[PDB]
Amino acid sequence: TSLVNSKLSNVKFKFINSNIKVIKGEKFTMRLQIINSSSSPLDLVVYYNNTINPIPLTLENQYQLHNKYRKIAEGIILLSNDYKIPVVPPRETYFADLRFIGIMSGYYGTLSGLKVLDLNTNELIEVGNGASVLIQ
């Protein structure tokens, strides 16, 4: 659960410092360690989307879901959007060093939004499940 795998491929993702607690507004860094051993190199790109996802239910559940989505969307933001990971040769690793900043106090357990897509078959693997940011 903490270490995530990619569908229709071999690559594996894990944040080195999975659990991190910091204060509001102080930029902090992660290390998205990568394992790639499938056949050939990749040019995957990681990005964070600060857009409110569309809801699909009673209002008591709809607004719960929307509060979750809104906090995910505009709680934490990435200082390295559209960071093309340069090359990952086969049977090798990479440290996609990311940088963040938070603006809304709370606990972003298994933070969504941070998704990485591969420019070989258009995957949308949710790599953000391995992070447990806590900004006060």
């Binding site: 509001k24 857009t51 933001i77 559209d82 603006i103 809304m104």
Partner: protein, 168 residues
């Protein structure tokens, strides 16, 4: 019909140019000197007028607003007007040049706002020798070109808004 004599210009030189070629860095403005001589031995021109003229102003269909909404029309038309009237500017040009005289005049090329097809620049001048103070002036043309290149520089391809929600 037999007129009076008419003079000629030759574009003796340009200071910071080589074969009428040069580059900008897409935002930096520069200036240089144009040296022109009056080859005639008797006549003296009493009129000069400089019109800058450019590749994008050449290479548009003269009917281009048929299928276009106002919002997309306005931005192109504004940048076109700006590029026409301010991309190349003339400072302290001369008014009269005596026969067999060479004159240097300054020209300021600035492109803070031009699209990524401004590859070409066709400054054409028109100089006029005064008639015998009766009716008119005898004009002429001269259409020296320039091949100005544009290099990429800092560019913003996206943004967001993400409104704040609470003080820090």
């Amino acid at each position: 019909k037999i007129l009076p004599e008419q003079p000629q210009l030759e574009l003796l030189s340009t200071s910071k140019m080589t074969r009428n070629s040069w580059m900008m860095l897409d935002g930096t403005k520069t200036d240089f000197h144009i040296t022109v001589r009056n080859k005639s031995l008797s006549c003296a021109i009493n009129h000069i007028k400089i019109i800058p003229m450019n590749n994008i102003e050449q290479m548009l269909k003269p009917d281009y607003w048929k299928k276009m909404p106002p919002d997309d029309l306005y931005i192109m038309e504004k940048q076109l007007d700006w590029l026409s009237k301010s991309c190349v500017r003339i400072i302290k040009l001369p008014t009269v040049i005596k026969p067999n005289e060479t004159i240097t005049f300054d020209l300021e090329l600035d492109n803070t706002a031009v699209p990524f097809n401004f590859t070409g620049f066709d400054l054409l001048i028109e100089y006029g020798m005064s008639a015998t103070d009766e009716s008119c002036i005898y004009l002429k043309k001269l259409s020296i070109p320039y091949e100005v290149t544009l290099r990429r520089t800092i560019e913003v391809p996206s943004m967001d808004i993400i409104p704040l929600n609470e003080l820090f």
